[PDB]
Amino acid sequence: HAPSYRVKRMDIAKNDEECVVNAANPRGLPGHGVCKAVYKKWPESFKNSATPVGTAKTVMCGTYPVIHAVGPNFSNYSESEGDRELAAAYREVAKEVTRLGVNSVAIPLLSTGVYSGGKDRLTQSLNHLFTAMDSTDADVVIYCRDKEWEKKISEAIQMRT
Ligand SMILES: [Ca+2]
Ligand SMILES: [Cl-]
Ligand SMILES: [Cl-]
Numbered sequence: 001h002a003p004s005y006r007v008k009r010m011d012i013a014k015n016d017e018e019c020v021v022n023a024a025n026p027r028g029l030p031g032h033g034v035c036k037a038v039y040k041k042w043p044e045s046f047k048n049s050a051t052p053v054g055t056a057k058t059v060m061c062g063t064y065p066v067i068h069a070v071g072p073n074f075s076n077y078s079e080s081e082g083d084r085e086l087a088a089a090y091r092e093v094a095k096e097v098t099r100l101g102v103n104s105v106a107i108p109l110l111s112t113g114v115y116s117g118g119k120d121r122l123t124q125s126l127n128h129l130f131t132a133m134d135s136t137d138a139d140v141v142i143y144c145r146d147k148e149w150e151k152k153i154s155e156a157i158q159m160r161t
């Protein structure tokens with residue numbers, strides 16, 4: 001086992017990893033985008049999944065862990081406070097991945113969809129992902145949907161190797 005990062009452009013509900021990170025909202029609602037796809041595939045994981053901004057809460061669907069990570073909605077937060085909460089959400093993901101003992105995890109880029117406040121946050125969100133996950137030994141598979149984002153994420157992964 002050599003821990004790795006990979007990126008795939010496809011629906012995270014089809015992931016091939018041992019657990020999934022949901023781009024969750026604080027109230028545990030079905031939501032939109034990635035969150036709604038996670039709700040359709042693992043609805044049982046939404047039982048008592050509500051948790052504050054900047055935190056993560058894991059709920060099992062059977063034995064399959066869904067890590068509900070709540071990034072900030074940048075429409076509501078200032079750039080400085082939102083940046084702090086986004087970094088914090090990813091730190092909580094790293095703790096949960098470690099506690100669960102999984103060999104791999106499927107992760108989306110938090111706060112880059114409807115919580116982005118209308119801005120391109122690929123680099124900001126990806127760099128906070130790396131800051132949290134670099135010290136873990138899980139294989140990390142990042143899921144995206146946009147063709148140009150796939151290329152940019154792949155370039156960012158490859159240039160550190
Ligand atoms: Ca918070
Ligand atoms: Cl590996
Ligand atoms: Cl797909």
Ligand SMILES: [Cl-]
Pocket residue numbers: 025031
């Ligand atoms: Cl929401």
Ligand SMILES: [Cl-]
Pocket residue numbers: 023110111112113114115116
């Ligand atoms: Cl989002």
Ligand SMILES: [Cl-]
Pocket residue numbers: 144145146149
């Ligand atoms: Cl994307």
